[PDB]
Design a protein around this ligand. Structure first.
Ligand SMILES: [Mg+2]
Ligand SMILES: [Zn+2]
Lengths: 225, 21, 83, 626, 160, 687, 237
């Protein structure tokens, strides 16, 4: 029977990968905590992403552009892989303008303030001499995986192609515990939890936000009294 | 193999072909 | 009643209802006609009320007339005769 | 409950939602509401949730063979475009989720809705109306989960074993809550024997007596239950008053259990406990860890030896045919037999080779799915391969699926597979046609009287007495002897009147019958119903799906035709008497059989006479007749 | 014929239950009894007699006996027949209702003699009701259930 | 709907037609797989409908005779000299011959090591014959097999039954957007794709002048070039895309017979209809029950398995005595929000996001004559709207269709085109939707394992290996034991090895399996691609030898032991299962049987011509069929009144149909049934 | 962010100490997120006091039966195992029970000093007979969770001692099940149903409040990584 209190440490293994040790847990309480945190981080972390874009030349996802070796649909597929940290809830925009040949990446996009393209080196499209790519995009906050909204549901403009919404700064989480189990029963569990985030914020920051939510949820549990 | 652009798809073939496909 | 409470369309336990009538087919009509009568009552509730009487057991918020009728039988709130 | 694509429900319940929001004035008149629905404004959706408040609907699947091919369900709105079917009724529907569809139909009139809600509701149509066996039995996954649960693994974790001196038994538990908390820790496993104190579980009648005695109600009375906690979490699923079981859960065990439950408990209790069993089975089938790999599917190490020994039986017989001593057909049949013995010997060796706890062995030994032979065909020796004509090639296969095939092995197996797959068109279409006949033939046989009060009847032999002297129960008793009504009284040596004429003849009656030494019975059957048109409900006796006497208005003829013609697709014959679906079909059409066997006409002595190309037999009578 | 109609019943039901039980398919023998009863319902005629009973025309045992009651008196002559068993397809075709059979098989051929024999259909049979859109005489269709008089208990009206 | 359904639809050997035998006349025997099919017709790829055994498909190596009698190439063993001679024979050219075993201990001298070799005798009998006596030997494995069948690794481990299902389903895959090549396939895929024409090729060698999404110029070494104009968003014969993506480089030399563009379901010039996914066949809480499937939701959010669905609605405005159906935005009685994504010229804006019921084309027509109801007369007198005497026969997206609009293909009489006598405007508007997958959509593997998705949850509750990895795909086990289909698990595990790589240790000598296991199969590095012939493949023992060195991908993790199984930890509980859990790599694909396509609902649509009965079809509002065989159980329930409902008013009573409309527009219980029309039409028929 | 729709909680009694708790509408999938954790907590976070070891006069190796009393020893053992007690010290407390004369010895006959309280006096123990005279000695403490029986290493010193398990957590069992409340109109919301059932010493609700306290503390221990981190919130009350 241990009368001590749990702790939580930090061990940053890479830029966006971190470890967190909690000691001591309770006999059998090991897994469930990391289990719950896995769900919360993966599903309950408010992020931001590009939602709907616009291209001066094209009116839908099913027309190519004169000059690009890539295609509009695969352009959306590429841009689905953006790592951009907005800071404000309201729609923010960007611009990608490039003419003449040259591999255009996610660094050539010109952002206004408040949006940090965490991936400036990720390729976007390939243009040629006739290549002329001038794309508008809108970024916005939220959480979870909001599907692509309908450009008609809102009284919106045709060039606006609604893209899916992925507000998830979490790459992968993995927990583990190690029961002590001495016959004398002075036993406790120790949670070696691991977080790996999507390069948009710190794993620590996402963990803090998940705890921010879960303290609310558990405060509801104590709220009966 | 015997194809101008194929990648290497190694297999466990037991015999050779008196004729191709 | 050593069961856990039924719910929804089976809240009236059909097994209990079978006891009231001699045979299930009797039960079917014994409920159908009464549900029709309940609708009739509602069709004359405001106007010149006829011999019909509506929900003799308390109706739901907006309950299906058959749902009320089956409840009428369950508590022996009605009487019937086979041909 | 049945899932329902919400849009489908809308365009089904179109006028209902039309009106409902019209008198909520969301649309002034009906036409405005029609355009509302057409445009699918949000308001139509919440109100749709209203109109589907306890409004039964119908679920059908082509084909419908037995009566339970259709089922009435109370529908619930479901997002998406797929109908979510409760995973228990699929047996009756015989519907698998490999792309199967369903047709949905709407009862309209109060007469209609009452017919659906009462007669056809899935919570009421439980037993298999053909043999009365539980048609909503938990299936593969649930059977596996419960079997994995209620086992009893020796040497498991936390088991009970008495000790003394330095540590007592250390296996006994004060409460199943104590055991569950223990198992929360790794100290106890599900299938490790324990011993708990129980008050909320009714002990078996033997224990209930020798502990509680006559005053033996479960709840207040405590008793010592030495089992596995899994069996407790299972047996709780039963009606609170059900006795404790303490058995491993074979598929048959559930058959008996649920037959009894439908016996002495109302359909509501069983309808609820089946859902609870479903939940448990899905909850534990996943903890079963029954997954297949090349590691699990072992091939026996002895197979080469066995097949080589039988290969000498083939190597030598090749020469003996070559010698010309044995004919060309001896080379066929003797080799087929040699290899059937070879494959049987391989099969037994594999059967005893696998661990008892093998995932696939778990599946088969729970009775969930498969025959052991389908395990054998995967690892080891498949057996004999066939031809379009239907013979067994004396040059067999030797490998298996884990052991891979060859061009020739696979090419020959192609015939044996294509044939079996092909006979699904002819046999199935004939089963449909046979049902089509029988339905018309029987449509005029409707239970018309509660009783004709007659005394005509059939006789059911019911377990003739053994020579050495015992009561050999006739193996076919429920199929042939249950659900009967006695045409007379069951009297023993002119002793006690055991059973009166016209008795429902359940297990209690037959238990005494096999106890009292009384064997023959007369049954008030339908072949003897004095009623001119239709049968009296007594002559028919107990209906299947009820476990009760039939009503006075049921068209039992169509039920019989369906039940007989339902399992037709599963009929197979042997390699001039046919014994497959054709054999029943022509027999039901009552024509001259091909392998005709003449019968006697006079009890007397026999003058057999071995004729040429066809024998002759006179029956010399015991009188001055011809 | 050599063992009467009761022994053929045992033979038939056992032989069919053999095939169904062969693959392990369980069906209670009462269903087979229902079918076989329809097999044996008729009786052939081996006597012209004095009432309509042409030799060789198969008829219902009940009808045979009914006519026998009438014609044992008022001129006593018994008609000789025999318990007979036919093919179930013939059994269907050999019904009181031309409509049912014609709605089963050989639509024209049977319809011919239906027209010839001025056969007025009873408009009462099950399949009849189905086609004509009338309520069938089964389950909740019989007049006993159809005409159940549901009225509130007088005390319930006293609850007004 | 895929390059295969393009190809294997040809090379089809049908049994029906003029000179052919009709199905009912087509008896049992003819459906059989005659011994004379070996090498000629595919013995496995046959339709599983009523045409089981009738409609046939070519083999791979087969040939067409000048006469047209089937010809198959084979070696001929002369005096125990199996000749490279490619001798074409048909069936009757065997009965005076003897075809031998296809894979024997042939020393390369043309003799057979063992005298007793499993040959086929003249009558097709397959037995042992001495080495020097048989006269003909086969050409090679995968000679008696077709192409689609030749895309199933471990066919020899798969039941011939299920193999049929897998082959037929390979013809039903849907065009996705990646078309991952199988990590484990067959060597025929690369050949089978270019031959399908669905892969753009460098017909002539020379340098790649330039690469572009709309064209690719191959500058031939001699002066001229070859410009290739590509085919993008060209609707397929079954409403899908013919997308042809380039996998080439702006300057690389392309050869005669090398790719220029991958097609809808190809990559690197081999067929690729799906994706390669890690497995664990543990049953997950009764949501993958009975052929129901649960997937890793990453694959949905990634759209790894998702399909583009082009479609065209044809709008044909013709010449009439009413006039002509002038397609403009002149809509009678139209709101504002409904024109938002529409262009003035009578259609939607090209690139209009549209939905179910959405008005697509305004095919406005004159209405005709009618008595103007006094109420509407007062209305047009009271509020001031026009008669609006034009019958708007516009297109509204019928039930359950949506998606962006591609564009329009319009031909016109004023365009001076060849339109028939009257049709002055032919319009083909095109609407696409990339249907993100959902439950009810049919998926399938390459070994017949198939079924609709029961459910797909987020990655939260996904058991993980000793690599901390949630798995791709989770299936039900119970289909495997009873369907002789451990073959997909065989490919599962070998694909695990092909994804992690291996090095069969020839430390001191080639390992015993490794000896007749061909060379360079002792070597492999992670994330690799392989093949396996249908009968001559990676034997069970060989695979046992492929587990020995199980060199991981990244971490130190040998999960599948030498014998096969691996260990998993639940992603819900965080608690271990009693037994090791299977894993490994499976090929999967999406089938063209979407629940977006197979739903039909109807309260009341139109009715038949003669009878007042509804019609049949999802296209027309139609109506559901209630058959006699349903009537049987319907009475067996004893539910007479519902059956009277079915056949009287739910089908055929007009006034009552309005009555019930009156009933539940009056909020009143549906009253006594009427007597129906088709019943009266029955009477008219009879009278 | 905010929950955007405030969930509630309703406690519903079933017995004096056994109650269910319905929470709704949780955000999608959140039923499992907290339910399994919460049941584990209730099982392993609420302090309480339970018996730990036992020794009775007469028995040294006869771990079957002892005179005076008629039933076996295991029966008395399991009777005492399910004993409700509350202690205010983490030192080992000792209690005795000594009933002379035949009759029915109960849990009301035990003499617990102050600082150790019993909440089931009227729980029968032994069928003392034959003028039976007994002396049972109970070593008791308080803790949390389930602690199995720790055997006596000092076998000689306490050789008539009996190690025994201890249900330190005062709750007996809790179960949880999720639901599909307003999945269509409100995007797959779920409702959790909890069923908690506890000893008579404490209530069902109070241990729940304490579990909420412990878990909110445990997650504050983590949220103190980025104090101003934008997670999710609830709103008013
Ligand atoms: Mg099927
Ligand atoms: Zn009778």
């Amino acid at each position: 029977l241990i009368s001590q209190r749990p702790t939580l440490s930090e061990d940053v293994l890479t830029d966006n990968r971190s470890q967190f040790v909690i000691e001591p847990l309770e006999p059998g309480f090991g897994y469930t905590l990391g289990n719950s945190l896995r769900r919360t981080l993966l599903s309950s972390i408010p992020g931001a992403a590009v939602t709907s874009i616009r291209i001066d030349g094209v009116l839908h996802e099913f027309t190519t552009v004169p000059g690009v070796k890539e295609d509009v649909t695969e352009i959306i597929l590429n841009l689905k892989s953006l790592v951009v940290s907005s800071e404000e809830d309201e729609p923010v925009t960007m611009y990608l303008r490039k003419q003449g040949p040259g591999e255009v990446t996610a660094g050539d996009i010109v952002p206004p303030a408040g949006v940090t393209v965490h991936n400036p080196g990720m390729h976007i499209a390939t243009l040629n001499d006739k290549g002329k790519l001038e794309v508008e995009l809108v970024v916005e906050r939220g959480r979870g995986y909001v599907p692509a909204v309908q450009n008609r549901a809102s009284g919106a403009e045709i060039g606006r192609i609604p893209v899916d919404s992925i507000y998830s700064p979490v790459l992968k989480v993995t927990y583990k515990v190690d029961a002590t189990r001495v016959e004398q029963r002075t036993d406790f569990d120790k949670l070696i939890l691991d977080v790996e985030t999507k390069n948009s914020i710190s794993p620590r920051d996402a963990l803090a936000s998940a705890g921010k939510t879960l303290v609310e949820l558990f405060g509801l549990a104590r709220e009966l009294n | 193999n015997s194809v101008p652009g194929a990648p290497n798809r190694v297999s466990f073939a037991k015999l050779r072909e008196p004729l191709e496909v | 009643g050593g069961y856990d409470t039924p719910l929804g369309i089976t809240n009236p336990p059909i097994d209990e209802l079978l006891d009231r009538v001699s045979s299930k087919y009797a039960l079917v009509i014994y409920a159908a006609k009464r549900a029709r009568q309940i609708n009739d009552y509602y069709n004359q509730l405001g106007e010149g009320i006829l011999e019909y009487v509506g929900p003799l057991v308390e109706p739901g918020l907006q309950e299906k007339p058959l749902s009320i009728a089956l409840r009428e039988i369950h508590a022996d709130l009605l009487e019937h005769t086979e041909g | 409950q049945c899932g329902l694509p919400k849009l489908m429900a809308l365009e089904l319940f179109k006028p209902f939602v039309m009106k409902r929001l019209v008198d909520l004035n969301h649309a002034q008149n009906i036409k405005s509401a029609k355009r509302m629905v057409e445009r699918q404004r949000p308001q139509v959706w919440d109100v749709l949730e209203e109109v589907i408040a306890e409004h039964p609907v119908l679920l059908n699947r082509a084909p419908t063979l037995h009566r339970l091919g259709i089922q009435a369900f109370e529908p619930m709105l479901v997002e998406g475009k797929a109908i979510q079917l409760h995973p228990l009724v699929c047996e009756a529907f015989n519907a698998d989720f490999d792309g199967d569809q369903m047709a949905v139909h709407l009862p309209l009139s109060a007469e209609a809705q009452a017919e659906a809600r009462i007669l056809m509701l899935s919570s009421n149509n439980i037993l298999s109306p053909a043999s009365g066996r539980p048609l909503a039995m938990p299936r593969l996954d649930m059977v596996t989960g419960l079997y994995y649960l209620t086992t009893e693994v020796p040497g498991d974790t936390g088991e009970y074993q008495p000790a003394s001196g330095d540590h007592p038994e250390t296996g006994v538990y004060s409460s199943p809550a104590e055991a569950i908390m223990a198992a929360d820790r790794g100290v106890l496993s599900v299938r490790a024997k324990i011993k708990v104190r129980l008050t909320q579980l009714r002990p078996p009648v033997e224990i209930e007596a020798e502990l509680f005695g006559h005053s033996g109600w479960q709840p207040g009375d405590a008793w010592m239950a030495e089992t596995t906690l899994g069996r407790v979490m299972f047996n709780e699923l039963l009606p609170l008053g059900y006795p404790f079981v303490n058995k491993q859960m074979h598929k048959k065990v559930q058959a008996a259990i649920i037959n009894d439950l439908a016996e002495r408990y109302p359909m509501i209790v069983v309808a609820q406990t089946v859902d609870k069993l479903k939940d448990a089975g899905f909850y534990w089938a996943t903890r079963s860890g029954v997954t297949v790999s090349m590691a699990d599917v072992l091939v026996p190490p002895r197979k080469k030896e066995i097949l080589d020994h039988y290969e000498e039986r083939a190597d030598k017989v090749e020469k003996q045919f070559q010698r010309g001593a044995l004919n060309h057909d001896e080379r066929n049949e003797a080799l087929v037999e040699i290899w059937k013995e070879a494959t049987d010997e391989v099969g037994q060796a594999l059967r005893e080779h696998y661990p008892d706890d093998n995932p696939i062995i778990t599946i088969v030994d729970s009775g969930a799915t498969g025959n052991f032979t389908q395990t054998r065909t995967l690892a080891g020796m498949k057996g004999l391969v066939t031809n379009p004509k239907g013979e067994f090639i004396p040059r067999p296969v030797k490998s298996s699926f884990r052991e891979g095939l060859t061009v020739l092995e696979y090419f020959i197996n192609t015939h044996g597979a294509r044939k079996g797959l092909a006979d699904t068109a002819l046999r199935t279409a004939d089963s449909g046609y046979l049902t089509r006949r029988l339905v018309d033939v029987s449509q005029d046989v409707i239970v018309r009287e509660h009783d004709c009060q007659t005394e005509r009847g059939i006789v059911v032999e019911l377990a003739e007495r053994a020579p050495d002297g015992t009561l050999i129960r006739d193996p076919y008793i429920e199929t042939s002897a249950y659900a009967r009504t006695l045409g007379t009284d069951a009297v023993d040596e002119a002793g006690n009147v055991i059973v009166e004429r016209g008795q429902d003849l359940g297990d209690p009656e037959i238990d005494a019958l096999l106890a009292a030494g009384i064997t023959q019975v007369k049954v008030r059957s339908v072949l003897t119903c004095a009623t001119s048109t239709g049968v009296c409900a007594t002559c028919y006796g107990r209906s299947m799906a009820t476990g009760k006497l039939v009503d006075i208005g049921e068209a039992v003829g169509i039920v019989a035709a369906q039940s007989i013609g339902e399992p037709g697709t599963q009929l197979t014959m042997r390699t001039d008497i046919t014994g497959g679906l054709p054999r029943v079909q022509e027999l039901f059409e009552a024509r001259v059989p091909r392998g005709k066997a003449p019968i006697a006409d006079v009890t007397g002595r026999v003058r057999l006479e071995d004729g040429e190309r066809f024998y002759k037999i006179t029956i010399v009578p015991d009188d001055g007749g011809e | 014929r050599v063992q009467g109609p009761r022994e053929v019943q045992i033979h038939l039901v056992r032989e069919v239950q053999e095939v169904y039980r062969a693959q392990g398919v369980s069906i209670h023998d009462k269903h087979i009894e229902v079918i076989v009863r329809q097999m044996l319902r008729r009786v052939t005629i081996i006597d012209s007699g004095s009432t309509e009973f042409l030799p060789g025309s198969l008829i219902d045992r009940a009808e045979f006996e009914a006519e026998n009651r009438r014609v044992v008196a008022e001129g006593g002559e018994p008609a000789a027949g025999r318990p007979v068993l036919m093919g179930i397809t013939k059994a269907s075709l050999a019904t009181d209702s031309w409509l049912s059979a014609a709605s089963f098989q050989e639509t024209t051929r049977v319809l011919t003699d239906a027209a010839i024999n001025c056969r007025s259909d009873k408009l009462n049979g099950l399949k009849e009701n189905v086609i004509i859109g009338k309520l069938i005489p089964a389950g909740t269709g019989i007049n006993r259930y159809r005409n159940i008089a549901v009225q509130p208990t007088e005390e319930a009206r006293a609850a007004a | 709907n895929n390059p295969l359904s393009g190809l294997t639809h040809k090379r089809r050997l049908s049994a029906l037609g003029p000179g052919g035998l009709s199905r009912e006349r087509a008896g049992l025997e003819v459906r059989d797989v005659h011994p004379s099919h070996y090498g000629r017709m595919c013995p496995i790829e046959t339709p599983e409908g009523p045409n089981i055994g009738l409609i046939g498909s070519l083999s791979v190596y087969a040939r067409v005779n000048p006469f047209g009698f089937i010809e198959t190439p084979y070696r001929k063993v002369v005096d125990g000299v199996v000749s490279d001679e490619i001798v074409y024979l048909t069936a009757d050219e065997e009965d005076r011959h003897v075809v031998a075993q296809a894979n024997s201990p042939i020393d390369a001298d043309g003799r057979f090591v063992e005298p007793r070799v499993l040959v086929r005798r003249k009558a097709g009998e397959v037995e042992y014959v001495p080495s020097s006596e048989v006269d003909y030997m086969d050409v090679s494995p995968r000679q008696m097999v077709s192409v689609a069948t030749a895309m199933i690794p471990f066919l020899e481990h798969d039941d011939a039954n299920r193999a049929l299902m897998g082959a037929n389903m390979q013809r039903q895959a849907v065009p996705l957007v990646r078309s991952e090549a199988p990590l484990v396939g067959t060597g025929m895929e690369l050949r089978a794709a270019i031959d399908a024409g669905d892969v753009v090729v460098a017909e002539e060698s020379g340098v790649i002048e330039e690469v572009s999404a709309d064209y690719i110029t191959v500058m031939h070494d001699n002066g001229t070039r070859r410009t290739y104009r590509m085919r993008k968003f060209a609707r397929s014969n079954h409403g899908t895309c013919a997308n042809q993506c380039p996998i080439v480089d702006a300057g690389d030399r392309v050869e005669a017979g090398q790719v220029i563009a991958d097609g809808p379901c190809t990559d690197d010039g081999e067929m690729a209809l799906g994706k390669n996914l890690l497995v664990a066949i543990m049953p997950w809480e009764g949501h993958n029950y009975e052929d129901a499937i649960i997937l890793s939701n990453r694959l949905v959010e990634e759209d790894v398995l998702t399909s583009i669905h082009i479609e065209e609605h044809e709008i044909d405005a013709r010449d009439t005595k009413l006039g002509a159906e002038e397609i403009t935005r002149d809509i009678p009685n139209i709101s504002d929000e409904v024109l938002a994504d529409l262009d003035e010229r009578g259609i939607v804006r090209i690139g209009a996001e549209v939905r179910d019921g959405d008005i697509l084309v305004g095919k406005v027509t004159p209405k005709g004559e009618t008595e103007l109801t006094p109420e509407e007369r007062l209305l047009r007198a009271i509020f001031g709207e026009k008669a609006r005497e034009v019958r708007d026969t516009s297109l509204k997206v019928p039930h359950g269709e949506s998606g962006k609009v591609i564009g329009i293909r319009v031909f016109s009489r004023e365009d001076e085109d060849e339109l028939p006598a009257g049709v002055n405007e032919l319009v083909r508007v095109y609407v696409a939707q990339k249907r993100k997958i959902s439950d009810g959509d049919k998926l399938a593997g390459r070994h017949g394992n198939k079924g609709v998705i029961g459910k797909i949850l987020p990655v939260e509750d996904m058991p993980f290996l000793a690599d901390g990895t949630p798995v791709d795909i989770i299936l039900n086990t119970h289909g495997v034991p009873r369907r002789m289909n451990i073959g997909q698990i065989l490919e599962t595990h070998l694909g695990w090895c092909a994804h992690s790589g291996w090095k069969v240790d020839a430390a001191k000598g080639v390992p015993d399996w490794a000896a007749r296991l061909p060379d360079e199969l002792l070597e492999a590095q992670p994330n690799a691609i392989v093949s396996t012939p249908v009968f001559d493949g990676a034997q069970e023992a060989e695979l046992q030898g492929l587990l020995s060195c199980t060199l991981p991908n990244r971490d130190g993790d040998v999960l599948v032991d030498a014998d096969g199984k691996a260990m998993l930890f639940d992603g819900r509980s965080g608690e271990p299962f009693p037994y090791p859990v299977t894993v490994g790599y499976m090929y999967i694909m999406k089938l063209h049987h979407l629940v977006d396509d197979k739903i039909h609902a109807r309260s009341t649509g139109p009715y038949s011509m003669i009878t007042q009965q509804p019609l049949g079809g999802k296209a027309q509002f139609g109506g559901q069929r209630f058959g006699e065989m349903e009537c049987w159980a319907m009475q067996a329930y004893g539910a007479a009144y519902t059956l009277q409902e079915l056949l009287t008013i739910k089908s055929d009573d007009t006034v009552g149909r309005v009555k019930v409309y009156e009933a539940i527009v009056k909020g009143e219980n549906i009253p006594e049934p009427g007597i129906p029309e088709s019943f009266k039409v029955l009477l008219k028929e009879l009278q």
